[PDB]
Design a protein around this ligand. Structure first.
Ligand SMILES: CC(C)[C@H](NC(=O)[C@H](C)NC(=O)OCc1ccccc1)C(=O)N[C@@H](Cc1ccccc1)[C@@H](O)[C@H](O)[C@H](Cc1ccccc1)NC(=O)[C@@H](NC(=O)[C@H](C)NC(=O)OCc1ccccc1)C(C)C
Lengths: 99, 99
């Protein structure tokens, strides 16, 4: 589709067999999900943003469906106040910016 | 222009009599720039992201140009490590996400 930006670009996703919404985020290199249960091995990492840093669990090879398109890749889980799909999955679903 | 997302979507902007590089950010409500001098007597403002909140300065009716598309709006300034163009300006230049 084509999504305008007068509102937050919040879309429906499926991950871990759960429906959620997430922000399609051109300014995020990575994908960061609100605190949840995911099965699998992970490893601690740390990410930085506006407020500073946070600890997150990194999981690789996680599948997510975003507005009907599938992507598989790394996902970080931690205390973000919003789920964020970053350029790592956005490129897989063919997403681009246009003006 | 069509921008893809293998790399950070950095473009060149003109603001405040200065040329700068910044990130087109669909997950930023507001535009936020690294410390510079701007025209006007600013109002304080709180913004949050990954890691909590920071206090920044808000300057309204600021002239900005992005890839030759002019826009006027609020621009915040404070301790971002990167310049960010938020949806407040992205909608003015007719920017959309597409897939
Ligand atoms: C991982 C990402 C989330 C991202 N950071 C990165 O990509 C970093 C630098 N990458 C990285 O990989 O480094 C860590 C690392 C190190 C070692 C190993 C592994 C990893 C990030 O924070 N990205 C931000 C840009 C940035 C980049 C570098 C440094 C600082 C900032 C925005 O693009 C990103 O789009 C976030 C998304 C977001 C939205 C909401 C909550 C949390 C995060 N938006 C924001 O941070 C913006 N906030 C907003 O848009 C908020 C929600 N609005 C707002 O606060 O308005 C007023 C308000 C007032 C009162 C209450 C509420 C709101 C902010 C820039 C304006």
């Amino acid at each position: 589709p084509q999504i305008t930006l007068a509102k937050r670009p919040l879309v429906t996703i499926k991950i871990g067999g759960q429906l959620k919404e997430a922000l399609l985020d051109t300014g995020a290199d990575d994908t960061v999900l609100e605190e949840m249960n995911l099965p699998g091995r992970w490893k601690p990492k740390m990410i930085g943003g506006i407020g500073g840093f946070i600890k997150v669990r990194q999981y690789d090879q996680i599948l997510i469906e975003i507005c009907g398109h599938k992507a598989i890749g790394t996902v970080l889980v931690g205390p973000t106040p919003v789920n964020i799909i970053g350029r790592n999955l956005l490129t897989q679903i063919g997403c681009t910016l246009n003006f």
